[PDB]
């Protein structure tokens, strides 16, 4: 069978697919084991290490991500992967483990930017030019 | 086998350094033109100078003498289309300063804006002098 | 005598454009075909159909 899933993060969407397999995980055509840098690699591998061995050894996963930086992509991918693992395994034990570790795994973040205002529009909404007196 | 001060034409250089940076000490020769010279000469620019035979020194100086004949491109040269000869040519050290001086002097002789600015000691390329250029 | 009274044509620069409503020279909106100055647009905008919305 096949299970499709999604994941979001600031200006970034990931679509994931899971099925039966050997244990392969590709993120946008290149394996996870050689993702760079390490700070973005551990982010994606965390759920695959939490789930365990006898669960991931028998699933092949695929992810396609688009938009918003390497950190955004990695987090969206971790979210999609965790949701798909839970949907595929049906283990409240796994659910509670993931939620103890970090609840955003399954309950994604909900933060975007804030528009800017007209004193220093490039810098931001609350940075302002320097006064003189 | 190794030396500490080599003597290319007129000027002396630091053998503890690489050749492309040691040749950078001759006025009129940068890093890019030094690289070009060394490539047309057949020398690695990463070897510590001092391991520079009189063979190589002579070759470099003969290169510097007439670069556009050894195939240095005419655009990558200091003084193209000289005033009274055409003859895209190159100048280092003692010749260079005299060319600068003669150019400014002929600008001064015909009583031109640029020469008058050179005299008075002011900017020449259209800058604004009210808030900056303070001595 | 009729020649030395009226302008040379300008296809570019600053004297090429002029406000439709009042006749000003310098500040002119050109966005999406408009030809009003920054002053007349602020007065005739709620008629053209613009809103605050911000």
């Amino acid at each position: 069978r096949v299970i499709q899933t999604a994941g979001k993060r600031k200006t970034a969407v990931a679509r994931a697919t899971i099925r039966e397999g050997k244990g392969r995980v590709r993120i946008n055509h290149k394996p996870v084991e050689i993702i760079e840098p390490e700070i973005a690699r551990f982010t994606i591998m965390e759920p695959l290490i939490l789930a365990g061995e006898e669960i991931v050894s028998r699933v092949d996963i695929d992810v396609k991500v688009e938009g918003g930086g390497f950190m955004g992509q990695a987090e969206a991918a971790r979210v999609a992967i965790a949701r798909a693992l839970v949907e595929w395994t049906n283990d409240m034990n796994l659910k509670e483990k993931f939620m103890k570790y970090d609840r955003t795994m399954l309950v994604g973040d909900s933060r975007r930017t804030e528009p800017h205002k007209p004193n220093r529009s490039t810098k931001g909404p609350r940075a302002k030019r320097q006064k003189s007196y | 086998n190794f030396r500490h001060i080599v003597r290319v034409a007129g000027v002396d250089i630091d053998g503890h350094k690489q050749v492309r940076w040691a040749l950078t000490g001759i006025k009129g020769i940068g890093i890019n033109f030094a690289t070009m010279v060394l490539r047309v000469a057949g020398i690695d620019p990463f070897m510590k100078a001092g391991y520079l035979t009189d063979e190589q020194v002579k070759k470099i100086e003969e290169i510097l003498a007439d670069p556009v004949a050894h195939g240095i491109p005419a655009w990558a040269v200091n003084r193209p289309k000289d005033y009274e000869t055409g003859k895209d040519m190159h100048l280092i050290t003692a010749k260079l300063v005299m060319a600068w001086r003669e150019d400014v002097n002929r600008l001064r002789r015909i009583r031109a804006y640029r020469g008058i600015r050179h005299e008075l000691g002011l900017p020449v390329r259209g800058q604004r002098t009210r808030s900056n250029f303070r001595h | 005598k009729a020649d030395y009274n009226k302008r040379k044509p300008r296809k570019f620069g600053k004297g090429a454009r002029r406000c439709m409503r009042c006749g000003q020279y310098g500040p002119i909106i050109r966005i999406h075909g408009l030809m009003l100055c920054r002053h007349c647009f602020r007065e005739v905008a709620p008629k053209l159909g613009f809103k605050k919305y911000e």
Binding site: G23, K30, P31, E33 | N32, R39, A76 | -
Partner: protein, 149 residues
């Protein structure tokens, strides 16, 4: 086994080492006297940079083909230190890329679609996958989790 299963820098090194045994790929007259972009100041510090350039161009054509000479010009650009003025991104030049693509065609590694970029031929697609299989057989000794691919 395939290009998408190995790192790009390693692959490019291992491909540029082999691009030299191919004779249709040779530097031109003006290679030593030239800078790789308006956005640069000093010349390349290597004597065999042409082959790295042509390997990278080969592999980018592979990946993002059909691709012509403006997207590669953009990918081979960068920000220029302009002095007291602030920095801006600028594009590279369009003779190196063009001569590289022409030489690759002469070797028969790429073909031009009539009006749509430029693409790889089957032998050009064989070269890289061969080299990648080799490099992977090598890495699997240090990264024992690369076997399943």
């Amino acid at each position: 086994a395939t290009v998408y299963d190995v790192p790009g820098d390693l692959l490019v090194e291992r491909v540029a080492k082999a691009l030299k045994e191919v004779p249709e790929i040779k530097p031109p007259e003006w290679a030593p006297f030239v800078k790789t972009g308006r956005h640069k100041e000093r010349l390349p510090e290597q004597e065999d940079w042409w082959y790295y350039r042509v390997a990278s161009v080969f592999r980018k054509v592979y990946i993002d083909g059909p691709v012509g000479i403006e997207r590669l010009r953009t990918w081979y650009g960068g920000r220029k230190n302009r002095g007291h003025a602030p920095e801006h991104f600028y594009k590279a030049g369009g003779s190196i890329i063009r001569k590289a693509l022409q030489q690759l065609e002469a070797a028969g590694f790429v073909q031009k679609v009539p009006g749509e970029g430029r693409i790889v031929t089957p032998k050009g697609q064989s070269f890289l996958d061969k080299i990648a299989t080799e490099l992977k057989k090598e890495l699997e000794e240090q990264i024992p989790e690369l076997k399943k691919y």
